[PDB]
Amino acid sequence: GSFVEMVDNLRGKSGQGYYVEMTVGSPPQTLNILVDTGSSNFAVGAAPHPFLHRYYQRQLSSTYRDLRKGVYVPYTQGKWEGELGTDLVSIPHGPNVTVRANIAAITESDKFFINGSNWEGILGLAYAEIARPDDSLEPFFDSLVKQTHVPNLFSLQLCGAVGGSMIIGGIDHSLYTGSLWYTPIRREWYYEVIIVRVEINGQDLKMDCKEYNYDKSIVDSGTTNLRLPKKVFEAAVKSIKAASSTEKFPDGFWLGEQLVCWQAGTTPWNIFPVISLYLMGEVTNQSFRITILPQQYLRPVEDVATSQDDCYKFAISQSSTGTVMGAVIMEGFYVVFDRARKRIGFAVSACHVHDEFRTAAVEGPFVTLDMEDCGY
Numbered sequence: 058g059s060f061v062e063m064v065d066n067l068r069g070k071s072g073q074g075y076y077v078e079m080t081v082g083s084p085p086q087t088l089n090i091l092v093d094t095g096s097s098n099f100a101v102g103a104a105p106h107p108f109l110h111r112y113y114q115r116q117l118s119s120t121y122r123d124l125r126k127g128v129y130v131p132y133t134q135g136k137w138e139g140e141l142g143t144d145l146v147s148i149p150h151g152p153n154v155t156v157r158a159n160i161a162a163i164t165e166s167d168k169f170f171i172n173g174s175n176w177e178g179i180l181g182l183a184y185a186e187i188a189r190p191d192d193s194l195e196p197f198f199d200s201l202v203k204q205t206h207v208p209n210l211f212s213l214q215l216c217g218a219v220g221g222s223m224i225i226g227g228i229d230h231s232l233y234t235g236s237l238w239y240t241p242i243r244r245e246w247y248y249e250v251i252i253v254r255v256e257i258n259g260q261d262l263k264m265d266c267k268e269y270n271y272d273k274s275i276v277d278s279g280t281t282n283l284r285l286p287k288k289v290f291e292a293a294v295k296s297i298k299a300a301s302s303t304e305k306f307p308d309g310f311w312l313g314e315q316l317v318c319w320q321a322g323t324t325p326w327n328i329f330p331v332i333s334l335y336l337m338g339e340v341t342n343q344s345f346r347i348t349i350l351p352q353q354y355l356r357p358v359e360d361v362a363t364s365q366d367d368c369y370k371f372a373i374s375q376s377s378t379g380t381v382m383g384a385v386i387m388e389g390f391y392v393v394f395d396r397a398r399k400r401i402g403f404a405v406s407a408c409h410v411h412d413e414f415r416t417a418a419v420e421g422p423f424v425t426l427d428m429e430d431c432g433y
């Protein structure tokens with residue numbers, strides 16, 4: 058269960074998350090589980106569903122323990138419900154350990170599972186504060202750290218086209234180039250961070266930095282898009298439209314309602330600007346930036362029927378729940394969730410995005426003297 062054996066342990070489909078293989082129960086039942094830094098439950102499909110290839114069968118596990126507690130999770134566009142219990146859990150291409158963990162056996166759901174995603178459950182990697190029904194339900198990673206000698210850290214190397222790596226208990230130096238820059242975890246609930254500055258093709262958006270973090274900024278592998286608060290989304294779209302003015306796209310493209318297509322191999326990457334997110338550093342008024350190319354924010358939509366063309370969805374969207382640095386932001390970066398030191402490291406990954414003109418980057422330090430607190 059070394060780091061080499063953990064390399065390439067993730068798979069996925071574009072816009073459908075990254076998943077890792079796990080086993081639940083005795084004898085082990087193999088399931089594909091979404092790696093989610095934006096939630097804190099280990100929630101697995103435990104009843105038949107038209108989108109599930111397989112599911113957790115509690116009756117077949119001798120080690121299953123029922124907690125006699127239901128869990129009901131409604132949200133805007135859907136819901137999931139289930140029963141809480143505990144069982145033996147392993148990650149075959151992860152640490153060489155078996156732990157007893159809480160499991161939310163999903164019995165009913167609406168618009169939760171995805172057709173052809175190839176995953177059957179979600180591994181919520183965030184803190185107990187956001188666990189459902191409440192903070193007393195110990196998340197998986199907490200159980201793993203308590204029961205084993207595994208260091209309190211994990212890292213994610215999400216690669217586009219999908220695949221990548223989840224390294225538990227350490228940093229795999231073969232997965233990144235250059236320096237690892239750290240941003241403090243503001244509060245241990247979601248992986249909450251602070252954005253101090255936003256530039257679009259080197260041009261500062263010129264907003265009070267609190268606007269970037271209205272009402273929180275999080276690092277979420279379970280969200281596809283870069284999600285931005287209304288004011289920031291509007292200014293970003295205006296700036297991207299201006300840089301890409303040689304071509305006009307429908308309003309629906311800017312809203313995520315429609316694809317933009319070009320003849321295969323002709324995508325005009327150069328008309329689209331680079332987006333720079335400046336993250337709060339580990340020392341006062343110091344920051345570093347992560348640079349996002351259009352190869353990350355224009356997500357390819359694979360469709361045999363549109364295959365004479367290369368088609369893309371605009372992977373930046375409006376949020377009313379704060380900034381979300383989703384999968385398109387994480388892609389090409391090696392992201393260290395250093396729980397032990399309450400910080401998140403970013404470095405250029407071995408699968409980073411680039412063309413012959415520009416590259417995705419992690420650069421610093423940047424100083425500011427006229428800075429307030431950028432948090433809410």
Ligand SMILES: COc1c(C)cc([C@@]2(c3cccc(-c4cncnc4)c3)N=C(C)C(N)=N2)cc1C
Pocket residue numbers: 072073074075091093094095096097098100130132169170171179181189277278279280281
């Ligand atoms: C606590 O209950 C939840 C909720 C409310 C949301 C998510 C989910 C979620 C749920 C179902 C599918 C996905 C999903 C879909 N497409 C791509 N990646 C992930 C995400 N939604 C977000 C924003 C997230 N980070 N995880 C997971 C769980 C377990």
